[PDB]
A paper describes a structure:
The benzonitrile ring of 3 overlaps with the S4 subsite and tucks under the L4 loop of caspase-6, which places the nitrile group close to the sidechains of His168 from the L2 loop and His219 from the L3 loop.
Due to the role of caspase-6 in neurodegeneration, there is strong interest in developing selective, small-molecule inhibitors of this enzyme.
Numbering used by the authors:
A (entry chain A): 31 to 174, 198 to 291
B (entry chain B): 30 to 175, 197 to 291
C (entry chain D), D (entry chain C): 2 to 5
The structure:
Amino acid sequence: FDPAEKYKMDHRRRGIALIFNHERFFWHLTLPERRGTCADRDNLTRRFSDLGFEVKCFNDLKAEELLLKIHEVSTVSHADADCFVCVFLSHGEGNHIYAYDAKIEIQTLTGLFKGDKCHSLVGKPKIFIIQACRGNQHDVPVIPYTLPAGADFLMCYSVAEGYYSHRETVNGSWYIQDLCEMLGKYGSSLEFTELLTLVNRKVSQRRVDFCKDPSAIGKKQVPCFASMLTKKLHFFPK
Amino acid sequence: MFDPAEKYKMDHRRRGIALIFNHERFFWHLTLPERRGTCADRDNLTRRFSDLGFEVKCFNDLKAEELLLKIHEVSTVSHADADCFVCVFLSHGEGNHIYAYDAKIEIQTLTGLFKGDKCHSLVGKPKIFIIQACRGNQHDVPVIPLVYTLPAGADFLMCYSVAEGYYSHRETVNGSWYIQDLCEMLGKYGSSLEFTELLTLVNRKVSQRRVDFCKDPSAIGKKQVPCFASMLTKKLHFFPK
Amino acid sequence: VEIX
Amino acid sequence: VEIX
Ligand SMILES: COc1ccc(-c2cc(C(=O)N[C@@H](CO)Cc3cccc(C#N)c3)co2)cc1OC
Ligand SMILES: COc1ccc(-c2cc(C(=O)N[C@@H](CO)Cc3cccc(C#N)c3)co2)cc1OC
């Protein structure tokens, strides 16, 4: 048993990074436009490409087309790849995000990549990054062998469950900005979860300094990653 | 300067309290079976956690109201003198709740008492919850590999024996898969490894297990992976004090 | 084996 | 600032 064991990241390809980018929504949903999300998408495209990923972006898909796309990806072989990344930039609540015309349960998306559904990813990291609200609380400032089919998922959320997640209308989301900065500086050397912990510290330093809603001033946000990984994860240059 | 190596300060006078809520049996109407094996788990944690400096307090089979009373007391005592806080729950469970003796309790009810705006002497300090309970009714199957302010929600580490939606397993003599492997990894690496690194080892150990014998034949071969959810902002170690 |  |  080896405490330093790492995932084997010496396949021919790093793998695919899917980005689902949602800027606007069917009017009946009554959701506002997500100005700043294009910055987030472009930033991720750049950082993820630099780490060897084949980045595919889709903008404002309807739920049926998104599910179709994601179903396609989960059924092509990843035998040649180190890992898989899937990013969602949208509005959200509870345990769902919004496509153009309807909400989708996060579980619906991750389920397609479970071991018994997606064999060529068994034993490999399956990484989901979600920038969306997770509820309606606004956090406040304070002053200081076989494998399980569920294994090897890493869920990276911009915010802990129950809370608002923040976005600047030009620079993009707090979380994606800080994630991309840390990937830019440390992505090809730091263990990924340690990298995410740095992200938690960056984001938790931010505060709402300006807002159209005065009662939001000073409010806060901490991200949260949920790991079912079984080994150390690195993106060393290939 | 931003320091990628930054650690929590773990040089206070006391490591801190570790509360263990141990549930073995339940009010008869709940119709929940006895959790044979759980005293092994409790005793094992008590020894590992004491060895790491914690002041261990166990409560067995409290009713909901008495448990919430107890946990409320702990959240209002000063922890100005402590490195961190640990709270362990060994019980039955589903969705996002666990059972006390007579009723279920939402996990968020328990964690909420320790948020930064409710528990000031723990602001800035790791708040670690370890939960051995089922999280749903799926049975996982085997597959073969081919100055700055702080948010009130910051600095929590939630360590679940299983991923959301699934059954969590227990042996009737040795205890739960998860707590056995967590204890072994604390035993071997607790006073040296970063704690999240340690939990990832626990993920790997538990995911090697399979149901080898079982009253229910269809359970044979089934599996379990744990999950930890981190809102920590720095590295966490339990070096000898 | 049993379950929780 | 806006929210998601
Ligand atoms: C929170 O509610 C419940 C919690 C636990 C049980 C529960 C546990 C067991 C149990 O451990 N049964 C053992 C009796 O020895 C046989 C068994 C059954 C299913 C899966 C496995 C496995 N592995 C084992 C039966 O019910 C039932 C609940 O209500 C639906
Ligand atoms: C999932 O459903 C929703 C998602 C987002 C909004 C949403 C976002 C904003 C928003 O960003 N408003 C800005 C101005 O556009 C003002 C504001 C309000 C509250 C908190 C902050 C912060 N921080 C900012 C308003 O509604 C509303 C939803 O259901 C009604």
